[PDB]
Every structure is written in structure tokens, then in C-alpha cells.
PDB file of C-alpha atoms and ligand atoms in Angstrom:
ATOM      1  CA  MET A   1      13.232   7.312  15.825  1.00 44.71           C
ATOM      2  CA  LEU A   2       9.565   8.012  14.734  1.00 46.92           C
ATOM      3  CA  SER A   3       8.082   8.459  11.280  1.00 45.41           C
ATOM      4  CA  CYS A   4       8.849  11.599   9.314  1.00 45.37           C
ATOM      5  CA  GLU A   5       5.113  11.850   8.492  1.00 47.01           C
ATOM      6  CA  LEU A   6       4.290  12.104  12.202  1.00 46.25           C
ATOM      7  CA  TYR A   7       7.043  14.753  12.734  1.00 43.18           C
ATOM      8  CA  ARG A   8       5.460  16.652   9.907  1.00 44.02           C
ATOM      9  CA  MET A   9       2.065  16.098  11.557  1.00 45.39           C
ATOM     10  CA  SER A  10       3.281  17.574  14.719  1.00 41.80           C
ATOM     11  CA  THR A  11       3.868  20.920  13.095  1.00 42.52           C
ATOM     12  CA  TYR A  12       0.060  21.128  12.546  1.00 42.60           C
ATOM     13  CA  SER A  13      -0.953  21.754  16.241  1.00 42.79           C
ATOM     14  CA  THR A  14      -1.258  25.506  15.491  1.00 39.90           C
ATOM     15  CA  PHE A  15      -3.067  24.899  12.100  1.00 43.81           C
ATOM     16  CA  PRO A  16      -6.110  27.338  11.946  1.00 43.86           C
ATOM     17  CA  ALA A  17      -9.609  25.611  12.299  1.00 45.51           C
ATOM     18  CA  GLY A  18     -12.239  25.138   9.464  1.00 44.60           C
ATOM     19  CA  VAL A  19      -9.658  24.520   7.081  1.00 44.85           C
ATOM     20  CA  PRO A  20     -11.465  21.970   4.803  1.00 46.41           C
ATOM     21  CA  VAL A  21      -8.468  19.805   4.214  1.00 46.84           C
ATOM     22  CA  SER A  22      -6.849  17.193   6.560  1.00 48.21           C
ATOM     23  CA  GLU A  23      -3.677  17.877   8.596  1.00 46.00           C
ATOM     24  CA  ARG A  24      -3.191  14.105   8.199  1.00 44.98           C
ATOM     25  CA  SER A  25      -3.502  14.297   4.359  1.00 45.22           C
ATOM     26  CA  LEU A  26      -1.257  17.566   4.202  1.00 42.17           C
ATOM     27  CA  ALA A  27       1.709  15.860   6.248  1.00 43.75           C
ATOM     28  CA  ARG A  28       1.043  12.544   4.323  1.00 43.63           C
ATOM     29  CA  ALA A  29       1.727  14.448   1.067  1.00 38.81           C
ATOM     30  CA  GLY A  30       5.047  15.657   2.292  1.00 40.67           C
ATOM     31  CA  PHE A  31       4.165  19.207   3.578  1.00 38.72           C
ATOM     32  CA  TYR A  32       4.612  20.605   7.052  1.00 39.39           C
ATOM     33  CA  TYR A  33       2.858  23.685   8.383  1.00 38.92           C
ATOM     34  CA  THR A  34       4.561  27.057   8.148  1.00 39.23           C
ATOM     35  CA  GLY A  35       2.686  28.778  10.891  1.00 38.94           C
ATOM     36  CA  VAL A  36       1.198  31.322   8.460  1.00 33.52           C
ATOM     37  CA  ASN A  37      -2.388  31.246   7.542  1.00 33.28           C
ATOM     38  CA  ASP A  38      -3.039  27.856   5.996  1.00 35.22           C
ATOM     39  CA  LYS A  39       0.189  27.866   4.048  1.00 35.20           C
ATOM     40  CA  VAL A  40       2.160  24.528   4.302  1.00 38.64           C
ATOM     41  CA  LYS A  41       5.495  23.619   2.823  1.00 38.79           C
ATOM     42  CA  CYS A  42       6.893  20.332   1.310  1.00 39.65           C
ATOM     43  CA  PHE A  43      10.046  19.434   3.297  1.00 39.99           C
ATOM     44  CA  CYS A  44      11.511  17.993   0.169  1.00 40.98           C
ATOM     45  CA  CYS A  45      11.089  20.481  -2.755  1.00 41.18           C
ATOM     46  CA  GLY A  46      10.163  23.701  -0.862  1.00 39.04           C
ATOM     47  CA  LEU A  47       6.658  23.988  -2.509  1.00 41.48           C
ATOM     48  CA  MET A  48       4.489  26.423  -0.860  1.00 40.61           C
ATOM     49  CA  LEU A  49       0.641  25.976  -1.073  1.00 38.75           C
ATOM     50  CA  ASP A  50      -2.072  27.939   0.633  1.00 38.93           C
ATOM     51  CA  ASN A  51      -5.875  28.964   0.423  1.00 42.31           C
ATOM     52  CA  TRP A  52      -7.080  25.371   0.502  1.00 43.10           C
ATOM     53  CA  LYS A  53     -10.726  24.601  -0.704  1.00 43.03           C
ATOM     54  CA  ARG A  54     -12.899  21.415  -0.310  1.00 43.26           C
ATOM     55  CA  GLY A  55     -12.177  18.365  -2.373  1.00 40.40           C
ATOM     56  CA  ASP A  56      -8.556  19.547  -3.173  1.00 40.18           C
ATOM     57  CA  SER A  57      -6.009  16.830  -3.063  1.00 39.30           C
ATOM     58  CA  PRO A  58      -2.634  17.755  -1.401  1.00 40.26           C
ATOM     59  CA  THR A  59      -1.195  14.528  -3.074  1.00 39.63           C
ATOM     60  CA  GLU A  60      -2.486  15.341  -6.587  1.00 36.66           C
ATOM     61  CA  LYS A  61      -1.892  19.242  -6.272  1.00 38.05           C
ATOM     62  CA  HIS A  62       1.694  18.330  -5.280  1.00 37.33           C
ATOM     63  CA  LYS A  63       2.253  16.050  -8.462  1.00 39.53           C
ATOM     64  CA  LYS A  64       0.576  18.799 -10.720  1.00 40.40           C
ATOM     65  CA  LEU A  65       2.865  21.594  -9.399  1.00 39.78           C
ATOM     66  CA  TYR A  66       6.419  20.216  -9.092  1.00 42.26           C
ATOM     67  CA  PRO A  67       6.718  16.602 -10.207  1.00 41.30           C
ATOM     68  CA  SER A  68      10.700  16.507  -9.952  1.00 39.64           C
ATOM     69  CA  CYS A  69      10.367  16.171  -6.276  1.00 38.56           C
ATOM     70  CA  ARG A  70      12.345  13.294  -5.065  1.00 41.83           C
ATOM     71  CA  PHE A  71       9.461  12.837  -2.452  1.00 43.80           C
ATOM     72  CA  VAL A  72       6.507  13.240  -4.746  1.00 42.19           C
ATOM     73  CA  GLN A  73       7.999  10.565  -6.871  1.00 44.76           C
ATOM     74  CA  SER A  74       6.044   8.217  -4.653  1.00 42.48           C
TER      75      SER A  74
ATOM     76  CA  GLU B   1      24.786  14.740  30.147  1.00 42.84           C
ATOM     77  CA  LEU B   2      21.883  15.201  32.647  1.00 43.87           C
ATOM     78  CA  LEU B   3      22.089  18.785  31.428  1.00 41.71           C
ATOM     79  CA  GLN B   4      21.362  17.183  28.037  1.00 40.57           C
ATOM     80  CA  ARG B   5      19.248  13.801  28.573  1.00 42.29           C
ATOM     81  CA  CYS B   6      16.731  16.023  30.076  1.00 41.67           C
ATOM     82  CA  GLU B   7      16.905  18.753  27.327  1.00 42.31           C
ATOM     83  CA  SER B   8      16.106  15.685  25.268  1.00 45.08           C
ATOM     84  CA  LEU B   9      13.238  14.661  27.344  1.00 46.74           C
ATOM     85  CA  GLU B  10      11.787  18.202  26.919  1.00 45.10           C
ATOM     86  CA  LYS B  11      11.954  17.897  23.112  1.00 46.95           C
ATOM     87  CA  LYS B  12      10.697  14.437  22.545  1.00 48.67           C
ATOM     88  CA  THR B  13       7.698  15.211  24.982  1.00 46.82           C
ATOM     89  CA  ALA B  14       6.686  18.514  23.258  1.00 42.77           C
ATOM     90  CA  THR B  15       6.541  16.753  19.926  1.00 42.84           C
ATOM     91  CA  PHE B  16       4.197  14.054  21.509  1.00 43.03           C
ATOM     92  CA  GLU B  17       2.054  16.899  23.126  1.00 42.12           C
ATOM     93  CA  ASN B  18       1.878  18.458  19.727  1.00 37.65           C
ATOM     94  CA  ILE B  19       1.011  15.266  17.837  1.00 39.88           C
ATOM     95  CA  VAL B  20      -1.651  14.328  20.160  1.00 43.42           C
ATOM     96  CA  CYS B  21      -3.164  17.858  20.088  1.00 40.99           C
ATOM     97  CA  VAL B  22      -3.662  17.213  16.240  1.00 42.89           C
ATOM     98  CA  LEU B  23      -5.342  13.929  16.789  1.00 47.29           C
ATOM     99  CA  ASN B  24      -7.803  15.426  19.270  1.00 49.67           C
ATOM    100  CA  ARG B  25      -8.831  17.723  16.464  1.00 54.03           C
ATOM    101  CA  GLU B  26      -9.125  14.829  14.021  1.00 53.14           C
ATOM    102  CA  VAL B  27     -11.168  12.752  16.255  1.00 53.61           C
ATOM    103  CA  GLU B  28     -13.682  15.595  16.824  1.00 54.00           C
ATOM    104  CA  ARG B  29     -14.100  16.310  13.194  1.00 50.97           C
ATOM    105  CA  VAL B  30     -14.679  12.609  12.965  1.00 50.64           C
ATOM    106  CA  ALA B  31     -17.417  12.670  15.631  1.00 48.26           C
ATOM    107  CA  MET B  32     -19.285  15.455  13.747  1.00 46.18           C
ATOM    108  CA  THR B  33     -19.293  13.146  10.821  1.00 46.48           C
ATOM    109  CA  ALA B  34     -20.663  10.117  12.769  1.00 45.20           C
ATOM    110  CA  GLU B  35     -23.197  12.364  14.541  1.00 43.60           C
ATOM    111  CA  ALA B  36     -24.439  14.247  11.446  1.00 42.44           C
ATOM    112  CA  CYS B  37     -24.761  10.828   9.732  1.00 40.17           C
ATOM    113  CA  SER B  38     -26.223   8.934  12.641  1.00 37.55           C
ATOM    114  CA  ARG B  39     -28.972  11.593  13.080  1.00 38.21           C
ATOM    115  CA  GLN B  40     -29.808  11.870   9.472  1.00 38.51           C
ATOM    116  CA  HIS B  41     -30.575   8.079   9.024  1.00 42.00           C
ATOM    117  CA  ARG B  42     -33.252   8.843  11.594  1.00 42.89           C
ATOM    118  CA  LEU B  43     -35.095  10.526   8.650  1.00 41.18           C
ATOM    119  CA  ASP B  44     -33.968   7.629   6.198  1.00 42.39           C
ATOM    120  CA  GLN B  45     -35.901   4.895   8.496  1.00 40.97           C
ATOM    121  CA  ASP B  46     -39.105   7.062   8.143  1.00 41.36           C
ATOM    122  CA  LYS B  47     -39.003   7.431   4.445  1.00 39.89           C
ATOM    123  CA  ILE B  48     -38.346   3.633   4.091  1.00 40.93           C
ATOM    124  CA  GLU B  49     -41.535   3.025   6.406  1.00 41.40           C
ATOM    125  CA  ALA B  50     -43.608   5.368   4.210  1.00 42.20           C
ATOM    126  CA  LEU B  51     -42.547   3.364   1.146  1.00 41.52           C
ATOM    127  CA  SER B  52     -43.160  -0.284   2.214  1.00 40.58           C
ATOM    128  CA  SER B  53     -46.467   1.043   3.433  1.00 41.20           C
ATOM    129  CA  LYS B  54     -47.101   2.620  -0.053  1.00 41.81           C
ATOM    130  CA  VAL B  55     -45.772  -0.742  -1.647  1.00 43.48           C
ATOM    131  CA  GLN B  56     -48.054  -2.938   0.500  1.00 44.71           C
ATOM    132  CA  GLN B  57     -51.135  -0.750  -0.546  1.00 43.72           C
ATOM    133  CA  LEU B  58     -49.894  -0.973  -4.165  1.00 45.26           C
ATOM    134  CA  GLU B  59     -49.328  -4.751  -3.707  1.00 43.93           C
ATOM    135  CA  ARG B  60     -53.055  -5.141  -2.584  1.00 44.61           C
ATOM    136  CA  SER B  61     -54.587  -3.257  -5.517  1.00 44.19           C
ATOM    137  CA  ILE B  62     -52.605  -5.251  -8.271  1.00 45.60           C
TER     138      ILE B  62
ATOM    139  CA  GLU C   1      17.426  25.020  36.462  1.00 46.30           C
ATOM    140  CA  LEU C   2      17.944  21.216  36.439  1.00 49.23           C
ATOM    141  CA  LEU C   3      15.370  20.405  39.319  1.00 46.52           C
ATOM    142  CA  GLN C   4      12.694  22.692  38.166  1.00 47.44           C
ATOM    143  CA  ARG C   5      13.138  21.389  34.637  1.00 50.47           C
ATOM    144  CA  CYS C   6      12.727  17.900  36.108  1.00 52.71           C
ATOM    145  CA  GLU C   7       9.771  18.867  38.254  1.00 51.27           C
ATOM    146  CA  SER C   8       7.958  20.313  35.305  1.00 50.53           C
ATOM    147  CA  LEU C   9       8.847  17.356  32.889  1.00 52.10           C
ATOM    148  CA  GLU C  10       7.322  15.033  35.360  1.00 52.24           C
ATOM    149  CA  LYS C  11       4.148  17.143  35.679  1.00 50.33           C
ATOM    150  CA  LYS C  12       3.853  17.434  31.759  1.00 53.71           C
ATOM    151  CA  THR C  13       4.469  13.608  31.411  1.00 54.67           C
ATOM    152  CA  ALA C  14       2.129  12.519  34.060  1.00 54.92           C
ATOM    153  CA  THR C  15      -0.744  14.735  32.547  1.00 56.66           C
ATOM    154  CA  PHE C  16      -0.021  14.002  29.115  1.00 57.91           C
ATOM    155  CA  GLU C  17      -0.326  10.318  30.013  1.00 58.66           C
ATOM    156  CA  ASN C  18      -4.025  11.079  30.992  1.00 58.29           C
ATOM    157  CA  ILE C  19      -4.901  13.587  28.228  1.00 57.55           C
ATOM    158  CA  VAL C  20      -4.188  10.511  25.847  1.00 56.98           C
ATOM    159  CA  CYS C  21      -6.631   8.509  27.792  1.00 59.62           C
ATOM    160  CA  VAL C  22      -9.245  11.171  27.365  1.00 57.37           C
ATOM    161  CA  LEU C  23      -8.369  11.238  23.843  1.00 58.15           C
ATOM    162  CA  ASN C  24      -8.633   7.445  23.222  1.00 59.67           C
ATOM    163  CA  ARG C  25     -11.614   7.248  25.462  1.00 54.34           C
ATOM    164  CA  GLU C  26     -12.984   9.642  22.801  1.00 55.30           C
ATOM    165  CA  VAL C  27     -11.825   7.407  20.196  1.00 58.94           C
ATOM    166  CA  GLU C  28     -14.103   4.639  21.723  1.00 57.18           C
ATOM    167  CA  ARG C  29     -17.040   6.835  21.974  1.00 58.36           C
ATOM    168  CA  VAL C  30     -16.674   7.612  18.419  1.00 60.19           C
ATOM    169  CA  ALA C  31     -15.896   4.121  17.018  1.00 61.18           C
ATOM    170  CA  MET C  32     -19.079   3.120  18.956  1.00 59.55           C
ATOM    171  CA  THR C  33     -21.207   5.674  16.865  1.00 56.27           C
ATOM    172  CA  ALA C  34     -19.399   4.514  13.673  1.00 55.97           C
ATOM    173  CA  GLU C  35     -20.338   0.819  13.929  1.00 54.67           C
ATOM    174  CA  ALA C  36     -23.979   2.083  14.548  1.00 50.15           C
ATOM    175  CA  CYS C  37     -24.086   3.864  11.279  1.00 49.17           C
ATOM    176  CA  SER C  38     -22.326   1.180   9.335  1.00 49.52           C
ATOM    177  CA  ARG C  39     -24.789  -1.515  10.513  1.00 50.82           C
ATOM    178  CA  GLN C  40     -27.349   1.140   9.450  1.00 48.84           C
ATOM    179  CA  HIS C  41     -26.463   0.559   5.662  1.00 45.68           C
ATOM    180  CA  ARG C  42     -26.495  -3.063   6.100  1.00 46.58           C
ATOM    181  CA  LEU C  43     -30.121  -3.038   7.516  1.00 45.59           C
ATOM    182  CA  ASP C  44     -30.947  -0.391   4.951  1.00 47.72           C
ATOM    183  CA  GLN C  45     -29.212  -2.172   1.971  1.00 52.32           C
ATOM    184  CA  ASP C  46     -31.465  -5.286   2.943  1.00 51.05           C
ATOM    185  CA  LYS C  47     -34.896  -3.267   3.169  1.00 52.96           C
ATOM    186  CA  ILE C  48     -34.217  -1.220  -0.045  1.00 52.55           C
ATOM    187  CA  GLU C  49     -32.923  -4.411  -1.942  1.00 51.72           C
ATOM    188  CA  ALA C  50     -36.252  -5.919  -1.041  1.00 51.11           C
ATOM    189  CA  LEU C  51     -38.545  -3.071  -2.050  1.00 52.70           C
ATOM    190  CA  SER C  52     -36.488  -2.582  -5.180  1.00 54.89           C
ATOM    191  CA  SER C  53     -37.800  -6.112  -5.853  1.00 56.49           C
ATOM    192  CA  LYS C  54     -41.294  -5.908  -5.003  1.00 56.57           C
ATOM    193  CA  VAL C  55     -41.676  -3.039  -7.200  1.00 57.34           C
ATOM    194  CA  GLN C  56     -40.067  -4.863 -10.241  1.00 55.58           C
ATOM    195  CA  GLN C  57     -42.673  -7.588  -9.552  1.00 57.57           C
ATOM    196  CA  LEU C  58     -45.508  -5.055  -9.798  1.00 62.19           C
ATOM    197  CA  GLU C  59     -43.849  -3.590 -12.750  1.00 63.79           C
ATOM    198  CA  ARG C  60     -43.793  -6.915 -14.390  1.00 62.85           C
ATOM    199  CA  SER C  61     -47.444  -7.562 -13.433  1.00 59.66           C
ATOM    200  CA  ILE C  62     -48.542  -4.348 -15.012  1.00 58.61           C
TER     201      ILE C  62
ATOM    202  CA  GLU D   1      16.306  12.483  43.701  1.00 58.89           C
ATOM    203  CA  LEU D   2      17.565  14.023  40.476  1.00 60.35           C
ATOM    204  CA  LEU D   3      19.289  11.211  38.749  1.00 60.58           C
ATOM    205  CA  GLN D   4      16.533   8.493  39.583  1.00 63.02           C
ATOM    206  CA  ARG D   5      13.690  10.992  39.301  1.00 61.40           C
ATOM    207  CA  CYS D   6      15.421  11.653  35.794  1.00 63.37           C
ATOM    208  CA  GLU D   7      15.814   7.838  34.791  1.00 62.30           C
ATOM    209  CA  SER D   8      12.106   7.451  35.546  1.00 66.14           C
ATOM    210  CA  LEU D   9      11.260  10.241  32.928  1.00 63.60           C
ATOM    211  CA  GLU D  10      13.279   8.193  30.579  1.00 64.38           C
ATOM    212  CA  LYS D  11      11.491   4.900  31.124  1.00 64.86           C
ATOM    213  CA  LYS D  12       8.117   6.575  30.819  1.00 63.11           C
ATOM    214  CA  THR D  13       8.928   9.049  28.050  1.00 61.63           C
ATOM    215  CA  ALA D  14      10.065   5.964  26.156  1.00 63.11           C
ATOM    216  CA  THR D  15       6.679   4.199  26.414  1.00 64.55           C
ATOM    217  CA  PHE D  16       5.076   7.316  24.865  1.00 64.38           C
ATOM    218  CA  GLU D  17       6.605   6.944  21.342  1.00 64.12           C
ATOM    219  CA  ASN D  18       4.627   3.750  21.062  1.00 61.27           C
ATOM    220  CA  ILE D  19       1.373   5.032  22.793  1.00 62.11           C
ATOM    221  CA  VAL D  20       1.309   7.717  20.098  1.00 59.42           C
ATOM    222  CA  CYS D  21       1.818   5.343  17.220  1.00 58.35           C
ATOM    223  CA  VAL D  22      -1.115   3.261  18.420  1.00 56.68           C
ATOM    224  CA  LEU D  23      -3.520   6.270  19.002  1.00 58.19           C
ATOM    225  CA  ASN D  24      -2.482   7.517  15.609  1.00 55.39           C
ATOM    226  CA  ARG D  25      -3.534   4.450  13.785  1.00 56.23           C
ATOM    227  CA  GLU D  26      -6.870   4.017  15.792  1.00 53.80           C
ATOM    228  CA  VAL D  27      -7.655   7.559  15.030  1.00 55.70           C
ATOM    229  CA  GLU D  28      -6.930   6.996  11.487  1.00 55.29           C
ATOM    230  CA  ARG D  29      -8.832   3.777  11.489  1.00 51.37           C
ATOM    231  CA  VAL D  30     -11.780   5.509  12.792  1.00 51.46           C
ATOM    232  CA  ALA D  31     -11.674   8.253  10.466  1.00 51.84           C
ATOM    233  CA  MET D  32     -11.830   5.925   7.691  1.00 52.67           C
ATOM    234  CA  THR D  33     -14.555   4.021   8.971  1.00 53.33           C
ATOM    235  CA  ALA D  34     -16.563   7.303   9.301  1.00 53.29           C
ATOM    236  CA  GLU D  35     -15.909   8.444   5.920  1.00 53.64           C
ATOM    237  CA  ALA D  36     -16.858   5.010   4.247  1.00 56.80           C
ATOM    238  CA  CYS D  37     -19.992   4.811   6.669  1.00 59.74           C
ATOM    239  CA  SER D  38     -21.021   8.446   5.399  1.00 60.63           C
ATOM    240  CA  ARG D  39     -20.821   7.237   1.702  1.00 65.60           C
ATOM    241  CA  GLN D  40     -23.045   4.345   2.734  1.00 62.82           C
ATOM    242  CA  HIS D  41     -25.692   6.916   3.688  1.00 63.88           C
ATOM    243  CA  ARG D  42     -25.380   8.958   0.552  1.00 67.07           C
ATOM    244  CA  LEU D  43     -26.578   5.832  -1.410  1.00 65.52           C
ATOM    245  CA  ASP D  44     -28.942   4.537   1.089  1.00 65.47           C
ATOM    246  CA  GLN D  45     -30.471   8.094   0.265  1.00 65.86           C
ATOM    247  CA  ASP D  46     -30.186   7.505  -3.492  1.00 64.36           C
ATOM    248  CA  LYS D  47     -31.789   3.874  -3.544  1.00 65.24           C
ATOM    249  CA  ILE D  48     -34.711   5.484  -1.416  1.00 62.66           C
ATOM    250  CA  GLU D  49     -34.986   8.106  -3.923  1.00 63.07           C
ATOM    251  CA  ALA D  50     -34.988   6.144  -7.004  1.00 62.31           C
ATOM    252  CA  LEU D  51     -37.213   3.389  -5.478  1.00 62.03           C
ATOM    253  CA  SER D  52     -39.626   6.052  -4.132  1.00 62.14           C
ATOM    254  CA  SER D  53     -40.196   7.430  -7.623  1.00 60.26           C
ATOM    255  CA  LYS D  54     -40.900   3.923  -9.263  1.00 60.11           C
ATOM    256  CA  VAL D  55     -43.706   3.748  -6.796  1.00 65.84           C
ATOM    257  CA  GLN D  56     -44.888   7.203  -7.795  1.00 67.79           C
ATOM    258  CA  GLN D  57     -44.476   5.916 -11.516  1.00 67.39           C
ATOM    259  CA  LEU D  58     -46.446   2.928 -10.500  1.00 67.81           C
ATOM    260  CA  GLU D  59     -49.329   4.535  -8.641  1.00 72.25           C
ATOM    261  CA  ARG D  60     -50.016   7.085 -11.400  1.00 69.17           C
ATOM    262  CA  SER D  61     -50.187   3.961 -13.618  1.00 69.30           C
ATOM    263  CA  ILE D  62     -53.119   2.624 -11.435  1.00 70.48           C
TER     264      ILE D  62
HETATM  265 ZN1  LIG E   1       7.959  18.119  -2.598  1.00 72.16          ZN
END
């Protein structure tokens, strides 16, 4: 009843502060929060990424690491 | 049913509270941006005034 | 159980509805500082585009 | 009580879905405005800097 993206965004309510990447940009790239550190996980492929730095692109870094992802295909 | 319409209300609701809690954070990051950027131009309007002052004196020599 | 869950739901719900106004009243405040800086490019485009010019007039003079 | 107090929780909770879409957008809109706006001041700062050095180039010349 309401966009997947926004359901993925809701898992960020607990995301730790001062992470230099957008919650919005994480959920947009298909990743929801795991509740551990700054580790997030793509609902589609199961790809786990953490330790995020400035100018990182979750969208790009997704494509680079697992391009077979039915989701990433967009 | 009411045992269940209501457990549904609980769920739909927590999701909204959680999503709006993320947007609060988003907006306040955005405020720091607008503020940092508004109050920096305060300088940028001074360097501009210094310039056009130098350019007028330089225009009056040439 | 059922009536406590209903009381609380209705308490959450009512406050949530006000938290959001807080939130989007924060959105108006911020948007108001955004348009202030974006108009501060436009005025600062037009004063630098002008001096950029005087200075190529002087440069051509010399 | 319970069954009407409960139907009320449904009417309202249903408006929330849309209230949270709107807020979401508006928060996104503003965050884009603010990040465009803060790359307008990265360049109102470079123009100033390259203009300010053609003037130094000029006044050394005279
Ligand atoms: Zn994936």
C-alpha cells in the first residue's frame, strides 16, 4: 500500500548519527538498515555494506559489487 | 477482527512514526547546510564590495 | 488489552498528527532560508558578471 | 466506545499514509534545493577568486 522505498526508509529510524551518507540515498539504492553499526542490506540480493565515507555512492557501489541483482538492474 | 484491525493500526502507525523520525533528521541536516551557506555569503558580499571598490579606483586611473 | 490498546493508539495517533506539523513547520522554516541563499547566487551572479566585464575592458585598454 | 472509537482510528490512520508521502517529497524537494543552493556558493566563491586576481594582475600592471 505505500512505496517499498519508504518501507526501507523506515528501518533507518535507529541509524547512528554523523554517518556521512543519506538514509534516503541508502534506501533509494535498495538497502535497508540492519541495526548494526552502519551496516545496511539490499532487500534483493542480500549485499551487505558498512563503514561508509563521504562522496560514496550507494547506487554506484551497489552496481560495482553485485550487478546480477534483479533490483540493481535499474 | 477487532482483535486484528487494531493490531493492524499498531503496525501501520509505528511505520509512520519511524519514517517521520528519519525525515526530522533529514530536514535538520538540510538546515545546517542552508545556515552554513547563508552565513558564509555574509563574507562573499564583503569581498565583492572590496572588489568593485578596487575596480572603480582602477577604472579612474586608466 | 483491547481498550488499553485503543487508548494508546489514539494517544500516539493524536500526537503523531502534531509532530508532523512540527516537522513540516520546520520544512517551511528551512525552505525560507533556501530561497534566501538561492536568490543570493542570482544577485551575486549579476555583480560578478559585471565586474568580470569591467576588468576585461580595462584589460583591453591596457 | 470500542467499535466507533476504533473506526475513528481507521479514518485518521488512513489519512496518515498520504500525509507522510507529501512530507517526504517536500523534505526531498527542500534537500535538493539546499544542495543546488550550496553549489551556487562554491562558484560565487570561485568567480570572486578569479576576478579578484585579475584585478591584482591589473594593478601590478599600473
Ligand atoms: Zn541488490
